[model samples]
Target: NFDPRPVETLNVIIPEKLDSFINKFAEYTHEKWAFDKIQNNWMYGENVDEELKTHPMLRPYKTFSEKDKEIYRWPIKESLKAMIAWEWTIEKAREGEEYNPQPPDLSGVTLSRELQAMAEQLAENYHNTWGRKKKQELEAKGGGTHPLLVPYDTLTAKEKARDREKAQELLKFLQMNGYAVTR
Candidate 1:
């Protein structure tokens, strides 16, 4: 699906104005998109950008008679770099990895057998969980329905409880190993 949206651009009159702009923008956006709101926030990139274009914090410079929308200098550039780094960290983490100022030694680290197997299983599970792809694969093999398809309501109460128990055990293992999961 293609989505079209409006984007706002900023034009600053001087380089010194950048620091205050960044500080204000960061504070406003952070407060507007607090940790809880992030899980289901409707405010988006364009919305925020548009707000910044007419931001109260940046308004003094807004009507400077020389406003252009190019957004090619100081604060804008730094903000873009920060955004790329933040987005990368948010949507693409693996095996409980996280950032640290002083990272651990990387001398002989390699994927453990168990972790490799877990990765393989995760790939298969992805193919199984997604209905369209799973059904397509099954149909190609003359099986019409997905091999792993199971109705949600069909799980027995005891089986569902057992599944929860297993998940808890996995979580326990992860916690013991200094790991955690994210959605």
Candidate 2:
């Protein structure tokens, strides 16, 4: 829920700070020199250096400013330039018709130890309690379980019906036991 929408925050930074800023950007930093993957295989990026030196539309705003009133505007302009340069490079490389860059290897993107432990705890809770009973009923039953009921599949008809009824019974029990579903 706290995650930012992709690329939405890219063009809001100051221009001179763009270099360091972009170097640290997350995936989908496209408002400046970034772009959508072409056909899912290629990412086009603009050359910030080239844009800073030559783009006509970007020259006037090229002057660096520290005024907090309009800080992001200049950098965003530069980013646009960078976007064009990056995209142009892609176009030229494609014209050769056969150039292919080697893909990078990234096999070490694992969850951190804390997150991994949290995931394991969730797995234990689900599997050891409700999940265990669900599995036990399935092995005893065999296949006629209701599609919408717990465990989804694998259970005897009698057990499935009994479990299903028990779940409903619990719902009613909870209501009588002071449980209420709040909006």
Candidate 3:
């Protein structure tokens, strides 16, 4: 059986200048995120002016200075460090598991449906606080009807998945910082 080596003792090879490729990966990820926002008509701005769906980093990743590109590189490096620092075992995932892996000693580590529901509630709270004022103004443009404002249970699977995407990010974040949902 394969066993995991502790962090200090886990001697392994890190590719020479791994940061070189990691930067490209970071750039590609930025493009991916930018496209998602651009699809919603977001545009670049001098600062992150959310009301107009604009952001300073909305420009092409290569256009950013070395210092600013670090912003995106930070997360990728952070993720790589966690795996190197922790003891882990890789196993073949089964059908219906998707990203979920239920090992002999691990369960409940996968993103939760309950967590998705909670994330939907959190989204509602944010919109309620900020969208309330903007609602009528936007509605005048076209009846400001956002279906996600409804209760989570009333949402379609697509809407539910969108909400779950928010919580999924949190799940990975917690996992990176040595925290995870125990229940």
Which candidate should be chosen as best, given TM-score against the real structure? 3
Q: Which candidate wins on lDDT? A: 3
Which 10 consecutive residues of model 3 have the lowest summed lDDT?
Answer: 97-106
Could you give candidate 2's per-residue lDDT for residues 86-174 as a string of tens digits? 33111111111111222212223234454334333323222234444555576689844433334323445654454344323322222
Give per-residue lDDT, candidate 2, residue 142. Answer: 87
> On residues 6-118, what C-alpha lDDT tens digit does candidate 1 reach at each position?
12224412234334433333332333323333334333232344433322223222332323222312323333333233231112123433100122222233445554344
Question: Candidate 2, which segments miss by more than 4 Å at Cα?
Answer: 1-152
User: With candidate 1 superimposed using the best TM-score fit, by how many Å does residue 122's alpha carbon deviate from the native?
Assistant: 11
**Per-residue accuracy of model 3 over 1-183 as CA lDDT, tens digit each:** 112121231354334554654575566557767777888788878888879998888877767899989887765554344333443321212222211111121134554675445445434333343345455556688774554454445557775664455435534334333433332
Residue 138, candidate 1: alpha-carbon lDDT: 68
lDDT of 2: 0.31
Q: Cα RMSD (Å) per model?
A: 20.6, 24.6, 15.4
Candidate 2 total steric clashes: 9
Query: How high is the CA lDDT of each candidate model?
Result: 0.34, 0.31, 0.50
Clashes of each: 0, 9, 1
- The clash number for model 1 is 0
